[PDB]
A paper describes a structure:
GPR21 is a class-A orphan G protein-coupled receptor (GPCR) and a potential therapeutic target for type 2 diabetes and other metabolic disorders. This receptor shows high basal activity in coupling to multiple G proteins in the absence of any known endogenous agonist or synthetic ligand. Here, we present the structures of ligand-free human GPR21 bound to heterotrimeric miniGs and miniG15 proteins, respectively. We identified an agonist-like motif in extracellular loop 2 (ECL2) that occupies the orthosteric pocket and promotes receptor activation.
Residue numbers in the entry:
A (entry chain G): 6 to 62
B (entry chain R): 25 to 234, 252 to 324
C (entry chain B): 3 to 340
D (entry chain N): 1 to 126
E (entry chain A): 9 to 63, 201 to 384
Write the structure that this text describes.
Amino acid sequence: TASIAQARKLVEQLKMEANIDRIKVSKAAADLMAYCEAHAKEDPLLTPVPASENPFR
Amino acid sequence: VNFCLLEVLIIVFLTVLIISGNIIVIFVFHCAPLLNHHTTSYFIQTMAYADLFVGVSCVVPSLSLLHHPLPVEESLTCQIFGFVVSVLKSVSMWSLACISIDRYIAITKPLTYNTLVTPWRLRLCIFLIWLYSTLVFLPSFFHWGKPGYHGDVFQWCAESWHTDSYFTLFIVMMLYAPAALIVCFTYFNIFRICQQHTKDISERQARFSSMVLFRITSVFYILWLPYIIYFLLESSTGHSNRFASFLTTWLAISNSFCNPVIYALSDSTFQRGLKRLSGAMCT
Amino acid sequence: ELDQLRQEAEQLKNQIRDARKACADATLSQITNNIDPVGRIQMRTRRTLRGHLAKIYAMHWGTDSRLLVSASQDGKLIIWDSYTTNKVHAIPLRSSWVMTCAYAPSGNYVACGGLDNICSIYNLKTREGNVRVSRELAGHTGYLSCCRFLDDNQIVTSSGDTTCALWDIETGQQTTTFTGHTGDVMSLSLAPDTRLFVSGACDASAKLWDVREGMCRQTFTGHESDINAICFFPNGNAFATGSDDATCRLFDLRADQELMTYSHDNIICGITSVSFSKSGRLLLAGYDDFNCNVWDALKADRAGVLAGHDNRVSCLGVTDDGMAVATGSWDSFLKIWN
Amino acid sequence: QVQLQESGGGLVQPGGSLRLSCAASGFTFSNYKMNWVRQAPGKGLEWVSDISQSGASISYTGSVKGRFTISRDNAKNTLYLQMNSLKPEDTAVYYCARCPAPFTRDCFDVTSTTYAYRGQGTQVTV
Amino acid sequence: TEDQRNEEKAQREANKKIEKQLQKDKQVYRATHRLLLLGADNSGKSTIVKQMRILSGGTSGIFETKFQVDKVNFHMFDVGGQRDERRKWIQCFNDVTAIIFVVDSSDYNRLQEALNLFKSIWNNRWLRTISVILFLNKQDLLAEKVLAGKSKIEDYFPEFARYTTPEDATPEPGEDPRVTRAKYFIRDEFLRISTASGDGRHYCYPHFTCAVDTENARRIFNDCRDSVLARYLDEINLL
């Protein structure tokens, strides 16, 4: 009773990754770079700011 | 005027290496703060302060000999200059002794060391170093005698002021010798402890098969001993060698920069702080 | 039927791997050759926050991006004003061995947890004025390695009993359990959309969990060793795991597989903490060579280093506005970088 | 995925030999110190043997010190336990186990209930 | 504004009070010595912390034990609450002066597990500097086992037959010398671990303790004193 339930559970807990509609990894790269090019200027580490804007300087 | 130039070249060389490194030691201790929270660091800071006052007090022989002799104090500045420098070296040497006193405590009471040696009593040791070194050398202003041969620079100070053999005795038995004997006792005991410990570790290791504080203290002491030896002889005898007096005094002032150099050559964390300075403060 | 279904799960794991290989149409580094490199990021210790007695093992920034909380194993949970370099509060913890601290988004609460197996919630904006523990969340058996507030009434806590849990502070019971992990759960990050969270464990697996259903949405096993710390990409559609095999990894949620590795041949010690910048272009990773390297997260290039500590860097955080980084470390001193 | 598959195993006489194998997947084999662990029936997990990253440092538990011998093929990514002179207390389930961190000398493999980087295990019996 | 400068002055006053409390607890923290207790369930770590306790420990999570001998604060942590894997929560005990590692010396099938655990402690990169106060416990049971026979060290350790006792004690093993051959051999099996690793950053301190004993706190005192003294001599060589 427990063994069949656990085996069915493990098959199901792999099946949900099988049920994942895998968007292509090229589109994954496109999404990552599109978020980074969209938010490029508002990043202080990537785009340094003057000491008037910088509260630590 | 060539001879005074030959005298002043070595002392301006001593100024331009004394001045720079003591500030570097303070900036490194401020930069690396795990290095900051040891007891020996604050005494090394106290030495850096005393050596920086040594530099900014020996700037004035450069003014006296480099150009025409300039008393801006207009009446016997060398005397108070002596009372600066002769205290300051004492302020340095007793500092070594107090380092030894903490290290000996760090060996004698190994566990309860932080119970024994606290930053309050640390600041109290530093304050009594400056206070004791100041107040015992005070009768140099009382004309009881010239305190030491710091002040050989100026041709009235080198000839008119006659040092006192008695005052020479009264300064060495409370400031010059007790620092030496406390360093001797503590480093003898610590070297004994390290020998016995290393013998035990060698035994326990071989049963189963298949000292920058000492270095800086010893360099300071050997740079300083010719000065005190000929100081005792020219005081008790009264017949002096001007060449040896000049050389031994500015050799005893030459020990001022020898702490940052050797402590940079030795210590790993101090080198990490100094590479942090050389990386960050420059560009 | 038991070994038959175990065999079926074995071919199912193999077909998941092969279907990911079929769905790995183009890698990230293939297309990013047209991108200009990020350049050399050089960052400096703007503030140096002193005043911890033992190793700092966790920190969390504030949502106002000025306050932060630091946790250290002397027993003190300290709230620091980063601007003024003033400790706003100090908290004597009941048990000093703590491994995590979390700052509430509202700021009224702060969390901590560790080897005493209770997640303590301290109220900051309190009636009396002295901060005190408001709740002690018991029920996990392993050590608590990460906690994160969703709100003033929902916190997810990871644990060393291989189970994450979603807790109600007001009742004091676990609303939901998340028991899929095999190894000790060492971190968790909640999404920007807060509907879901990913958690990494010592079993080299990072699992995506939905907070409302409470079931394992996804699993990723691309690492070799213990995943120490995890962090979502700010878009919420990816996350970066920092693991003890001297590599960071980027996993996308909808691709359901690894994207890139963030490692070099020279670096051989473990990631202890990992974080993201505001745009997510710079991936930040603390380490055990006493430094903090920053990578181009799109190009996988070691594009800077933050050397300011002489013990290992335990915790790493980035402000919500991005203006600062706070690298705590085992040398008892935390540092603010820009 | 970090996957260790066992091989060898099966029936052998009470004076016989088996070459237990473990193929490794999903990690650089050379970086990890490898171990052999056995689960005896009615007994907990107990460490049998280990080998360093380079194959230099090799150790065994005392019941099997002269009898068993291990070798690891980094070309084939396989950990080998030549099992000589079986006893009935040598009959157990045999797991290869890599140490949790790479480039390290310390190991925490043999645990009471579960450890992430063990294999599935092949049973050997009388 | 004026009110903002008043509020930042209040921030400075709060920071001053917090820093005063931090130094006031820093003195206590540096006065107290933290110790990590490790072992197994059969190894009498419970009774050993019982003689440290009798000469407020909670079960949940850490079990804490506080004691002093010769006015030195010792605070030692039994971890009774976590799981069976310890590769991560052992990293917390990196600022510890000394690990007390208790071994059941009379059970020779768990001795190899104890040796592997000691080897992991000695070779852990975050435990490379912590001395290990080894406590080979239950020497009454080891003596009774070896004198009783019917269970041999060569069953679980083949190299016992090529062993003789180099140095020993008269009064405690004075019943029979063969148990001495036992009680030092196990000791060497730890010291063979304790010697081969590292350039002397930490030191093992083996001890022989029965079921009930009194000088456990004194032994922890002297071995912590030697380890901290060795730390300060390595600092004298460095600082």
